[PDB]
Amino acid sequence: MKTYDLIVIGTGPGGYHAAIRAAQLGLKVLAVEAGEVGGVCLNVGCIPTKALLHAAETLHHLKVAEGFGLKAKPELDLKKLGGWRDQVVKKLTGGVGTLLKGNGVELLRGFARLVGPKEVEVGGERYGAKSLILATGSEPLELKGFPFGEDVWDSTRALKVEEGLPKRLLVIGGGAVGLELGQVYRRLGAEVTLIEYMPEILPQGDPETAALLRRALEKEGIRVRTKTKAVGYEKKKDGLHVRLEPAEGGEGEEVVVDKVLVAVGRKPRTEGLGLEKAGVKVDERGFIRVNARMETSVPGVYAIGDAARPPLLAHKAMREGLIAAENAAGKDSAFDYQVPSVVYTSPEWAGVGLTEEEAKRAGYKVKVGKFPLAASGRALTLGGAEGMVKVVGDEETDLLLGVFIVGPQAGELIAEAALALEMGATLTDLALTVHPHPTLSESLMEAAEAFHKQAIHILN
Amino acid sequence: MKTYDLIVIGTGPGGYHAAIRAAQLGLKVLAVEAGEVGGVCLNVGCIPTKALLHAAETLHHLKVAEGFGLKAKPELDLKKLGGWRDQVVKKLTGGVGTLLKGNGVELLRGFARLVGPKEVEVGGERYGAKSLILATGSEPLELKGFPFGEDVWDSTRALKVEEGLPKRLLVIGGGAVGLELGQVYRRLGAEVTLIEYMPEILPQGDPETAALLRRALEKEGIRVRTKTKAVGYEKKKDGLHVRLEPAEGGEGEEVVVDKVLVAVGRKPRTEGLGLEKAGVKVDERGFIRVNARMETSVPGVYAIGDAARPPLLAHKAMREGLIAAENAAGKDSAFDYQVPSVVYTSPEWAGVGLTEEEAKRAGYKVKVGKFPLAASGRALTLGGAEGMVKVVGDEETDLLLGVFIVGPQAGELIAEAALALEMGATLTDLALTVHPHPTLSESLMEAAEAFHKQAIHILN
Amino acid sequence: PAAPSIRRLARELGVDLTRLRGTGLAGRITEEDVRRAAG
Ligand SMILES: Cc1cc2nc3c(=O)[nH]c(=O)nc-3n(C[C@H](O)[C@H](O)[C@H](O)COP(=O)(O)OP(=O)(O)OC[C@H]3O[C@@H](n4cnc5c(N)ncnc54)[C@H](O)[C@@H]3O)c2cc1C
Ligand SMILES: Cc1cc2nc3c(=O)[nH]c(=O)nc-3n(C[C@H](O)[C@H](O)[C@H](O)COP(=O)(O)OP(=O)(O)OC[C@H]3O[C@@H](n4cnc5c(N)ncnc54)[C@H](O)[C@@H]3O)c2cc1C
């Protein structure tokens, strides 16, 4: 029986943040990892996908570049691209390993399973601690009628673009994963059709900015079918005959592709984890029930990231890991923050706060401000606008409630919006902050001006 | 017949913002422009320079792109580039004219001169108004021993890259203008030597982040010589023999180049404007004296932008124009905002608030936090992590005082810092905002954590 | 310092922020603080 102050299961964004923070706070920590250090985000999620998207955007932008004199006959070596992707991933995961050891955290490789409230079994050996933090993450969610196989891919397989690009790809799911991977394949030369059950892509975010992203993707040749669901498929000589139907069911239609990417969600990795031997409550979907302190139904046992609750985002997991670590260390921390969401497509999509509908439901007197990128000098100097900023606020208190952005660098600009919400900023605070000219960030400032009908670069 | 409530002299960022805001508040406006609508920023400043920088960065990044399989033999046609640059400028300046007209603003072409406290003369005709807003901008500052000519360019001439790139270029001045145009020319194939009189480039900004920018430029082959001044030169058969000398003087040295770019500053266009006939006070440097309300020594007469006071920045002029217009309209607005400054080189440089030295001078218990981009996952997915974020704050109150950034998108990230300062954020506020992962904006959050000695992605 | 909106509101209402003691979190001046001082 080897003991520690804390045992962290999983070294993904959540787990390694928890391990490190706890260590900084004086705790003796043991971190357990069954696969690659760094979790999904660094190995088969955020990182490799962002890498591929950057290469795709670089290639894509050359078409606009011909417009300003850049002549070139681009040829993209997919094996070399995959190599760079692997290189980036290795650098970052090795980096996490050095951070853990540099902080004095003990790393044990193997699959950890609880055998009790405060005891874990790994490789037949027992380990105990005063506090446990469950950061097991999630995995690709299977879709009825589309079992993963040689022709039905999950996001991990989709990352391996060097294993041959299909001529025709069908993407199931209009969330961040489907959209990003759909655009990567499209830019790399494939025909791409994406289907989404809900009325609009990114059903969790603002419909207006999401629609603008969809139209932009459609302009690139990506066929997007909303209010449509995939029911099944039949493999024939000419390809996979996929059967589609209206969301609410009805007349069936068919589409033929070479491969299918299923990106309809994630399943928390909470089965076979010994939770039923420790008394840890799990909800119907597999998520470990937790409170703002990230505490489970069992005192001293915390759960964070994808294993604890949606949204299944990295920065969220990271912050949750810090909260759980701090409390395990004796502090009184709690998670009560605005969590932004970003889609790294081109244009990018980003959002934080309340959508127009959520604000209304919350009882606010909803008012909005909008600013198109077409009126942006910076957008023009970057090769041409394509997007908009929408701010949602209360017409009575002038409080900023939500921000949605579609355009280049949307992901970088949403942090300012996140800060604004945390600081309790009003639309006037945002409008009165002097944003640098010329920059894409100005769109947030002018959207705020537009909210008060006094934007300068557009007629009100 | 035809009377006006307000006459705005100049349609640069300051002037057209003043005219438009005044029109929005119900004033009858007359805007006078002696040259191209849009002023320096849109015609020969911000816009054309940023367009050239983008083209150069697009070409430059292809070298890193070869690393991920993008093979090509890029060739940049300067004539085509110049045409696009011209297109971007025309599109925007035409947009300003459209906005002015759309707001009911009367545009008069000619050079305006005051002939009294509230009367202006343009082309022999007289116009009067209860309010006058002076937004005449500035012009390239001439340097002793380097009068502008065929071989000695100002920034305007330097913009015409399609008129023959010099084999060897000497840039005098390590400010935003010299650095940006210097990098453009270097990336276009010219050998570039840049001299700065001060000990470090961007002498008004943080020396640490500024130094990192200098090192990056030196890596590209730009020979930067700080603590060095240009004394004079003499045209010879093989080129211009320029005499360099230490800032303090002494050891004389000569460098041979084909062209000299003088970017040592600007001079406010306040002479021959009739200020002495109106009673408007001007300081020794030529700037129109104004208070927080942008009011001059003459009631009803305001001055904004470059003509009013440094820093000579566009977003500042735009805000000052809004304040002046609002005050001319009977409101009571004052300029008390944080003004960020951006250098659009690659990597970019941006800063806002107080440097360590200034914070110390103001009596704060200076403490800093630093986060290197080499530890950024997003930076790596973009093909290179080179830069850093430094936050300056007070150790006792935890109040944020300044933020300096060097790296890609620094100009976009600085907006978050400006808002933070405007909202009186503490380092804890900055660190607690959940920044999206992976993004470059995360560097601000982590720099804040580092300030508290608990950054995660780097040892503390 | 106070947020832009509060500083602007103070000018509008003729309130001198340097004479006020905020009742917000860490002495932060609120909009109601300004309105309360105004009349
Ligand atoms: C293609 C794709 C792209 C994405 N892009 C983004 C993006 O751009 N931004 C974003 O915010 N999010 C993105 N996400 C989601 C993001 O990856 C997750 O939110 C994040 O990885 C969750 O962190 P985590 O620490 O909770 O879990 P995970 O990273 O999954 O890590 C859990 C770790 O625990 C290990 N583990 C599990 N069970 C055990 C056990 N019993 N014993 C020992 N070790 C165990 C796993 O091997 C793993 O390393 C993306 C996801 C995908 C699929
Ligand atoms: C190469 C270069 C790059 C720059 N890049 C940036 C950048 O990236 N970001 C930034 O913030 N700043 C930048 N600047 C500085 C920025 O351009 C100025 O701060 C900004 O244009 C100032 O606006 P303004 O309205 O005060 O003056 P100006 O834009 O100069 O406009 C004044 C206008 O008044 C007209 N005028 C003058 N006198 C009269 C008269 N008597 N009668 C009638 N009309 C008159 C002029 O013709 C002009 O159109 C750059 C400058 C240069 C040279």
Question: Hey, are the CB atoms on C3 and B332 less than 8 Å from each other?
Answer: no
A112 lines ligand 1 (CB under 6 A): yes
Helices then strands, each counted (H, E), chain C: 2, 0
3-state secondary structure of A382: coil
The set of residues, in sequence order, having a beta carbon less than 8 Å from that of B326 and lying 6+ positions away, is B21, B25, B333
* Tokens standing for residue C24: 């917000």
* Tokens standing for residue B196: 């700065």
Contact A138, A130 (CB under 8 A): no
Distances (CA, A) of A106 to A18, A99, A160: 13, 11, 32
Residues in chain C: 39
* Chain A contact present for C23, CB below 8 A: no
Q: Which helix (H) or strand (E) holds A266?
A: strand A266-268
* Tokens standing for residue B164: 């023959």
3-state secondary structure of B105: coil
* Tokens standing for residue B35: 């040259």
The Cα B156–Cα B424 span in angstroms is 39
Smallest CA-to-CA distance from B84 within B48, B116, B136 is with: B48
Q: What is the DSSP letter of B399?
A: B
Any idea where the domains of chain C sit in the sequence? 4-38
CA dihedral A319, A322, A327, A330 (to 10 degrees): -150
CB neighbour class for A175 (10 Å; exposed up to 12, middle 13-18, buried from 19): buried
A306 lines ligand 1 (CB under 6 A): yes
Q: B169 to chain C nearest CA, in Å?
A: 45
The Cα B421–Cα A429 span in angstroms is 11
CA dihedral A147, A151, A155, A161 (to 10 degrees): 170
3-state secondary structure of B268: strand
The Cα B11–Cα A245 span in angstroms is 57
Smallest CA-to-CA distance from B447 within B408, B409, B393 is with: B393
CATH assignment, B338-460? 3.30.390.30
Any idea where the domains of chain A sit in the sequence? 1-140+265-337, 141-264, 338-460
* Tokens standing for residue B317: 């002029």
The Cα B420–Cα A415 span in angstroms is 11
Is it true that B141-264 and B338-460 share their CATH fold? no
Distances (CA, A) of A439 to A321, A382, B42, B439: 34, 10, 13, 17
The set of residues, in sequence order, having a beta carbon less than 8 Å from that of A114 and lying 6+ positions away, is A120, A121, A132, A273, A274, A275, A277, A278, A280
Q: Which of B36, B41, B275, B287 to mutate to test the pocket of ligand 2 (most atoms within 8 A of CB)?
A: B41
* Tokens standing for residue B128: 């009067």
Is the domain spanning B141-264 CATH 3.40.50.1220? The answer is no
The Cα B219–Cα B17 span in angstroms is 40
* Chain B contact present for A21, CB below 8 A: yes
Q: C6 to chain A nearest CA, in Å?
A: 8
CA dihedral A321, A326, A329, A332 (to 10 degrees): -140
The Cα B442–Cα A321 span in angstroms is 16
Q: What is the DSSP letter of A400?
A: E
Question: Hey, are the CB atoms on C3 and B337 less than 8 Å from each other?
Answer: no
Sign of CA dihedral B198, B199, B200, B203: negative
Contact B307, B134 (CB under 8 A): yes
Residue B254: how many CB atoms within 10 A of its CB? Answer: 12
Location of structure tokens 């105990």: A128
Location of structure tokens 């309809």: A264
**Residue type at C15 in one-letter notation:** V
A270 lines ligand 1 (CB under 6 A): no
Q: Which of A33, A36, A37, A40 to mutate to test the pocket of ligand 1 (most atoms within 8 A of CB)?
A: A40
Q: How far is CA A411 from the centre of its chain?
A: 11
The Cα B66–Cα A81 span in angstroms is 9
Location of structure tokens 């003043």: B18
End-to-end CA distance of chain C: 23
* Chain B contact present for A1, CB below 8 A: no
| Closest chain C residue to A424, measured at CA | C3
The set of residues, in sequence order, having a beta carbon less than 8 Å from that of A291 and lying 6+ positions away, is none
Sign of CA dihedral B319, B325, B331, B334: positive
CATH class of domain segment(s) B1-140+265-337: alpha beta
The Cα C16–Cα A145 span in angstroms is 69
Count of A-C CB contacts under 8 Å: 16
CB neighbour class for B73 (10 Å; exposed up to 12, middle 13-18, buried from 19): exposed
Smallest CA-to-CA distance from A445 within B28, A453, A455, A307 is with: A455
Smallest CA-to-CA distance from A102 within B460, B105, B127, C18 is with: B460
DSSP for A96-146 reads HHHHHHHTT-EEEES-EEEEETTEEEETTEEEEEEEEEE---EEEPPBTTB
| Closest chain A residue to C30, measured at CA | A424
Q: Resolution of the coordinates in A?
A: 1.9
Residue B207: how many CB atoms within 10 A of its CB? Answer: 18
The Cα A419–Cα A403 span in angstroms is 11
Question: Hey, are the CB atoms on A398 and C8 less than 8 Å from each other?
Answer: no
Contact B287, B138 (CB under 8 A): no
Q: Which helix (H) or strand (E) holds B255?
A: strand B253-257
Question: Hey, are the CB atoms on C8 and B422 less than 8 Å from each other?
Answer: no
B226 marked among binding-site residues:
no
End-to-end CA distance of chain A: 71
Angle at A77 between CA A75 and CA A79, to 5 degrees: 175
Query: Within chain C, what is the greatest distance between any pair of CA atoms?
Result: 24
The Cα B183–Cα B200 span in angstroms is 17
The Cα A204–Cα A349 span in angstroms is 12
Q: Are strands B106-109 and B125-134 parallel, antiparallel or unpaired?
A: unpaired
Q: What are phi and psi of B244, to 5 degrees?
A: -100, 160
CB neighbour class for B400 (10 Å; exposed up to 12, middle 13-18, buried from 19): buried
- Neighbors of chain B by Cβ distance (3+ pairs < 8 Å): A, C
* Chain B contact present for A187, CB below 8 A: no
3-state secondary structure of A401: strand
Smallest CA-to-CA distance from B185 within B344, B56, B43, B62 is with: B56
Contact A390, A369 (CB under 8 A): yes
DSSP for B341-357 reads EEE-SSSEEEEEE--HH
Q: What is the DSSP letter of B289?
A: P
Smallest CA-to-CA distance from B189 within B47, B78, B66 is with: B78
Quickly list H helices, A168-206. Answer: 176-187
Which one of the ligands is nearest to A138 CA? 1
Chain A residues 318-377 with a CB less than 8 Å from chain B:
318-319, 322, 337-342, 350, 375, 377
- Name all residues whose Cβ lies below 6 A of ligand 2: A 437; B 9-15, 32-35, 39-41, 45-46, 49, 111-112, 135-138, 155, 177, 269, 273, 305-306, 312-315, 317, 344
CATH architecture of C4-38: Irregular (4.10)
The set of residues, in sequence order, having a beta carbon less than 8 Å from that of B129 and lying 6+ positions away, is B3, B4, B5, B6, B7, B30, B118, B120
